[PDB]
Design a protein around this motif. Structure first.
Motif, PDB file in Angstrom:
ATOM      1  N   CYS A  93       0.842  -1.186   0.000  1.00 29.75           N
ATOM      2  CA  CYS A  93       0.000   0.000   0.000  1.00 29.75           C
ATOM      3  C   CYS A  93       0.880   1.240   0.000  1.00 29.75           C
ATOM      4  N   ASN A  94       0.450   2.261  -0.739  1.00 25.47           N
ATOM      5  CA  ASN A  94       1.211   3.501  -0.884  1.00 25.47           C
ATOM      6  C   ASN A  94       1.039   4.328   0.385  1.00 25.47           C
ATOM      7  N   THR A  95       1.870   4.039   1.384  1.00 24.95           N
ATOM      8  CA  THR A  95       1.821   4.762   2.647  1.00 24.95           C
ATOM      9  C   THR A  95       3.158   4.612   3.357  1.00 24.95           C
ATOM     10  N   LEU A  96       3.395   5.509   4.315  1.00 27.58           N
ATOM     11  CA  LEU A  96       4.581   5.463   5.156  1.00 27.58           C
ATOM     12  C   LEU A  96       4.266   5.442   6.643  1.00 27.58           C
ATOM     13  N   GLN A  97       3.032   5.736   7.035  1.00 29.58           N
ATOM     14  CA  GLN A  97       2.657   5.723   8.443  1.00 29.58           C
ATOM     15  C   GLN A  97       2.591   4.287   8.951  1.00 29.58           C
TER      16      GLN A  97
END
Ligand SMILES: CC(C)CCC[C@@H](C)[C@H]1CC[C@H]2[C@@H]3CC=C4C[C@@H](OC(=O)CCC(=O)O)CC[C@]4(C)[C@H]3CC[C@]12C
Ligand SMILES: CC(C)CCC[C@@H](C)[C@H]1CC[C@H]2[C@@H]3CC=C4C[C@@H](OC(=O)CCC(=O)O)CC[C@]4(C)[C@H]3CC[C@]12C
Ligand SMILES: CC(C)CCC[C@@H](C)[C@H]1CC[C@H]2[C@@H]3CC=C4C[C@@H](OC(=O)CCC(=O)O)CC[C@]4(C)[C@H]3CC[C@]12C
Ligand SMILES: CC(C)CCC[C@@H](C)[C@H]1CC[C@H]2[C@@H]3CC=C4C[C@@H](OC(=O)CCC(=O)O)CC[C@]4(C)[C@H]3CC[C@]12C
Lengths: 50, 50
Positions: free
Chosen positions: B1-5
């Protein structure tokens, strides 16, 4: 920046800060001094003429 | 998934797939066979009685 897509940082930085404040301040300071420089050059030319 | 959190992946996976299809299929198959099992047990009890 909270992102994982490559290139999502540079574009956002450019959008947030297109022109930095220091460049504008330097440009303003240099532009303000031009009439003084041209007056000095004109005075030098007048002194050379006489 | 395109996320960093951190934790943004597990929550999204749970939201997208709360219950997997295999669990539902297994539950349905096991529930369907219960009347057959109870009929077999009742027949065994009837045979034991006689
Ligand atoms: C700084 C430069 C940009 C335009 C210049 C001006 C352009 C035209 C003229 C008219 C000229 O007429 C004589 C005297 C100089 C002056 C005021 C120049 C002075 C120096 C200036 C302000
Ligand atoms: C800061 C310097 C880079 C500037 C400020 C004043 C300038 C001077 C102002 C007037 C003149 C006269 C001028 O004379 C003619 O053009 C003749 C030659 C350049 C000079 C010495 C300039 C050279 C560059 C100077 C030293
Ligand atoms: C499978 C279970 C769940 C409920 C059960 C039923 C609950 C009550 C009754 C009534 C009972 O009456 C006699 C006969 C068995 C039966 C149909 C059971 C058969 C087996 C069933 C369908
Ligand atoms: C699959 C097995 C795990 C099931 C299918 C049929 C079941 C049987 C159906 C009926 C009975 C009779 C029953 O007899 C009494 O309760 C008396 C004992 C369990 C048993 C052998 C069951 C044991 C478990 C079995 C073999």
């Amino acid at each position: 920046c909270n992102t994982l897509q490559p290139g999502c940082n540079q574009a956002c930085y450019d959008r947030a800060f297109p022109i930095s404040h220091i460049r504008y301040w330097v440009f303003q300071i240099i532009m303000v001094c031009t009439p003084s420089l041209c007056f000095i050059t004109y005075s030098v030319h007048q002194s050379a003429k006489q």
